[PDB]
Amino acid sequence: GSLTGALAMRLNDEDLDFLTKWTDFKCFVSASNMRNAAGQFIEAAYAKALRIELAQLVQVDKVRGTLAKLEAFADTVAPQLSPGDIVVALGHTPVGGIFDLKVGSTKHTLQAIETRVLAGSKMTVARVVDPTPTPPPAPVPIPLPPKVLE
Numbered sequence: 001g002s003l004t005g006a007l008a009m010r011l012n013d014e015d016l017d018f019l020t021k022w023t024d025f026k027c028f029v030s031a032s033n034m035r036n037a038a039g040q041f042i043e044a045a046y047a048k049a050l051r052i053e054l055a056q057l058v059q060v061d062k063v064r065g066t067l068a069k070l071e072a073f074a075d076t077v078a079p080q081l082s083p084g085d086i087v088v089a090l091g092h093t094p095v096g097g098i099f100d101l102k103v104g105s106t107k108h109t110l111q112a113i114e115t116r117v118l119a120g121s122k123m124t125v126a127r128v129v130d131p132t133p134t135p136p137p138a139p140v141p142i143p144l145p146p147k148v149l150e
Contacts, residue, residue: 002014003015003056006118007019007118007121007122010055010056011118011121014057015055015056016055016118016120016121017055018054018055018056018057018061018062019051019052019055019118019120019121020084020119020120020121021051021054021055021065021069021120022048022051022069022081022120023048023081023082023083023084023085023086023087023120024044024045024048024049024052024081024086024087024122024123025081025082025086025087025088026044026048026077026078026079026080026081026088027041027042027043027044027045027048027077027087027088028041028088028090029041029045029087029088029089029090029093030089030090030091030092030093031090031091031092031093031101031102031103032091032092032101032103033091033101033103033106034090034091034101034102034103034104035091035092040076040077041077041088043071043072043074043077044072044073044077044078044080045072046068046071046072047065047068047069047070047071047072047073047077048069048072048087050064050065050068050069051065051066051068051069052065052121052122053065054066054068054069055121083119084119084120085117085118085119085120085121085122085123086123087122087123089111089113090102090109090111091103091109091110093111095111095112095113096110096111096112096113096128096141097112097141097142097143098110098111098112098128098141100128100129100130102129107129108129108130108131109127109128109129109130110128110130111125111126111127111128112126112127112128112140112141112142112150113125113126113142114126114142114150115150126140126142126150
């Protein structure tokens with residue numbers, strides 16, 4: 001096999017290790033009412049995305065992602081994350097389809113993406129934090145031809 005599994009056909013130890021290098025939740029993705037003043041998140045987002053592309057160190061990939069990693073890991077894009085399998089994307093983040101923005105005194109999150117948890121690799125979750133228990137339309141609104149909702 002090699003480089004063929006559940007991580008877009010790269011869950012294998014080669015891409016999973018070079019992928020496991022770090023997490024993607026050191027970057028806050030467009031929160032909107034929370035994010036709008038500085039928006040300095042694309043630094044770690046670009047560095048880690050490149051590290052995901054480094055995970056494919058067939059030869060140089062690892063080197064591109066490591067240099068990019070430092071590029072962002074500079075100050076406010078390095079020591080801000082959890083143990084693994086996480087990336088920050090809240091509010092104005094095109095994936096939910098739901099309507100809830102969590103911003104402090106406006107803490108109501110709309111984020112329905114997927115159910116994928118790879119330690120040190122990508123993780124997609126479906127969660128809507130709102131004071132309402134029962135959702136008026138659908139339980140989990142994710143646009144996918146093979147799936148019904150989630």
